[PDB]
TrEMBL record, chain A:
Similarity section: Belongs to the Mu gp47/PBSX XkdT family.
Protein name in UniProt: Base plate protein
Ranges for domain Baseplate protein J-like barrel: 86-165
Domain Baseplate J-like central: residue ranges: 186-256
Ranges of residues in domain Baseplate J-like C-terminal: 263-345
Organism (species): Clostridioides difficile (Peptoclostridium difficile)
Bilayer-crossing regions: none
Entries under PANTHER family matching the protein: PHAGE-LIKE ELEMENT PBSX PROTEIN XKDT, PROTEIN JAYE-RELATED
Length: 346, 66
């Protein structure tokens, strides 16, 4: 191909193309024109080889990828600026106006709202990164410094880690994203397609779909908030409207929120020395709350009493009763145990 | 059975005073491979037994079933 086509090869080819009495000689004037044209033609061959690659969907550049995705209607992500809140410590009554820039090392951060040291609202003010990037996502407790000294301001530190700083999307990321988009398109009523739109709601984390719950075409949408806790009613409403904005033709949609199950417990236990009823009560309730957060399936009475005895301050235990029974209690779907009654006696 | 045997052996190494029947069932339920248990009897009984002087607990019979 064009790699085979070179200065020497095309030069000899052109020399053969000419039927002339002049013997071919190095440095001849006619040889000079032929050699110059062949050099520029070889350069043009290299350019053609390059525009092979530049015309492809892959191995594009910033402008090339931009044009391709604009033809596809896709747009690359420039990233987002980091956002956090810092604390200003210094002379009381000092007013830090909006637009003030605080520098941590070489990083530059700007204060959004006015903050007064010693004010009733406090000395905490949200601070946004001047530019996008992971480097702007500063951790907690960073000693920010004013670029411009302000009288009355001494120490600037963030009580929370800076977040929201996202980097510039790379070409490969956008290429793979576009390839996935073309590969997987929105369908009418696929479980994954419908569930993804529900996943866009911030409040909910886990989404489940129960089709045929009320006959053909009937879809029962099941949602789960933070660690499968029930979200607020307004969150349910906004999720319902959102999924209706993307729902297929003629579906019946019901959003189901997780339910809590109250738990009442009672036992007659012996407490270890130096420990009171309140301490063992709080420790065991925290432990059993963790267990409820991790319990899969139904309740295990033996596991409950095991976490009870393993709790510090339990000399011995007896007469353990949960919800009026000592048997294993079945947990149904969308039901999470909730600690409500703790009847502990020594 | 072997895992609970090791657990009860180290507990007896660490035990003092009396064997606690609730402690026995707690160390049995916490044992790996144990889902649910019932009718746990020590020497056929459900009561704590005092470990007297110059005396140590000794495991003799292990009866576990489903």
């Amino acid at each position: 191909m064009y790699s085979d086509q070179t200065y020497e090869v095309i030069k000899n080819r052109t020399l053969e193309n000419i039927n002339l009495d002049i013997y071919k000689g190095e440095g001849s004037f006619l040889n000079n024109m032929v050699s110059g044209n062949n050099l520029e033609l070889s350069k043009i061959y290299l350019e053609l080889s390059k525009m092979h690659k530049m015309a492809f969907i892959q191995d594009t550049y910033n402008q090339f990828l931009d044009k391709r995705v604009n033809e596809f209607g896709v747009y690359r992500k420039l990233g987002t600026e980091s956002n956090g809140e810092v604390e200003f410590i210094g002379e009381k009554g000092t007013v830090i106006n909006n637009g003030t820039i605080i520098s941590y090392r070489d990083l530059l951060f700007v204060v959004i709202k006015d903050v007064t040291i010693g004010s009733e609202e406090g000395d905490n003010s949200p601070v946004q990164a001047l530019e996008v990037g992971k480097k702007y996502n500063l951790p907690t407790n960073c000693e920010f410094k004013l670029v411009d000294n302000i009288s009355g301001v001494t120490k600037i530190t963030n009580t929370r880690s800076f977040e929201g700083g996202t980097d510039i999307e790379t070409d490969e990321e956008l290429k793979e994203r576009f390839y996935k988009i073309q590969r997987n398109q929105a369908t009418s009523g696929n479980k994954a397609h419908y569930e993804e739109w529900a996943l866009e709601v911030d409040g909910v984390y886990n989404v489940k779909v129960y089709p045929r719950w009320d006959g053909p075409g009937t879809v029962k949408v099941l949602i789960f908030g933070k660690n499968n806790q029930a979200v607020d009613t307004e969150t349910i409403e906004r999720c319902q409207q959102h999924i209706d904005e993307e729902k297929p033709i003629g579906p019946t949609i019901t959003v189901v929120t997780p339910l809590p199950i109250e738990i009442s417990i009672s036992a007659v236990m012996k407490l270890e020395d130096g420990y009171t009823l309140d301490n063992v009560k709080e420790s065991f309730l925290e432990s059993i709350n963790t267990y409820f957060r991790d319990i899969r399936g139904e309740i295990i009475y033996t596991k409950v009493m095991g976490i009870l005895i393993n709790t510090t301050g339990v000399h011995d235990l007896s007469n353990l009763l949960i919800n009026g029974s000592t048997d294993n209690i079945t947990i149904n779907e969308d039901k999470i145990p909730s600690v409500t009654t703790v009847n502990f006696s020594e």
